[PDB]
Amino acid sequence: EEVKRLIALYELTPHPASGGWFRETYRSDVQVEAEGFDGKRSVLTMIYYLMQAGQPDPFHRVKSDETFVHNLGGSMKIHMIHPDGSYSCSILGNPLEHPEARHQVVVPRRVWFAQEVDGYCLASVLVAPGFDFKDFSLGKREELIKEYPQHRDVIMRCTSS
């Protein structure tokens, strides 16, 4: 209602690492052995991911491209700090309502990213090679400020204390 209907209906649960809601809906039987990965991985995993205003999914990164796909709701800012230190922002949403928004956004592997919404957004989020906690890094405020001092504001807004 509408957020709760979607949480009920899709059986989302509060995301350990984030201010949002999720459930992994698919994990492929097929495996890849990929350099830079410790061990076999699944070819693909997909979650539902729902976000609400006020609670930013904080900076984090993985070893795969992460593909976001907009299902419902408002737009979703996806903040990105790339390894060369540069900052970009992609808008996930519906260009029919917001011309700068796209229904697909691919976050390159190794980019630190965080996300915020002004209302709520339901997304499907896919990762290939498939998600595994050994490949996940939750960013620490102080380490990120030290690495990227020129991005202090966005880092402050999108990390916990």
* Known binding-site positions for GDP: 15, 24, 45, 131
Q: Is 9 in the site for its own copies (CB under 8 A)?
A: yes
- Closest CB to ligand GDP among residues 44, 150: 44
Out of ligand GDP, its own copies, none, which partner does residue 34 contact, by CB within 5 to 8 A per kind?
its own copies
Shortest reach from residue 156's CB to its own copies, in Å: 32
Out of its own copies, ligand GDP, none, which partner does residue 71 contact, by CB within 5 to 8 A per kind?
its own copies
Distance from C-alpha of 67 to C-alpha of 154, rounded to nearest angstrom: 22
Distance from C-alpha of 156 to C-alpha of 3, rounded to nearest angstrom: 27
Look-up of token digits 């990390």: 159
Distance from C-alpha of 146 to C-alpha of 161, rounded to nearest angstrom: 15
Q: Is 115 in the site for its own copies (CB under 8 A)?
A: no
Distance from C-alpha of 15 to C-alpha of 58, rounded to nearest angstrom: 11
> Quick one: DSSP state of residue 20?
S
- According to DSSP H, which parts of 74-140 are helical? none
Q: Is 50 in the site for its own copies (CB under 8 A)?
A: no
Distance from C-alpha of 159 to C-alpha of 161, rounded to nearest angstrom: 7
Judged by the rule CB under 8 A, the positions of this chain that interact with its own copies are 2, 5-6, 9-10, 25-26, 28-34, 43-44, 46, 48, 64-65, 67, 69-72, 94-96, 103-104, 106, 122, 124, 126, 128-129
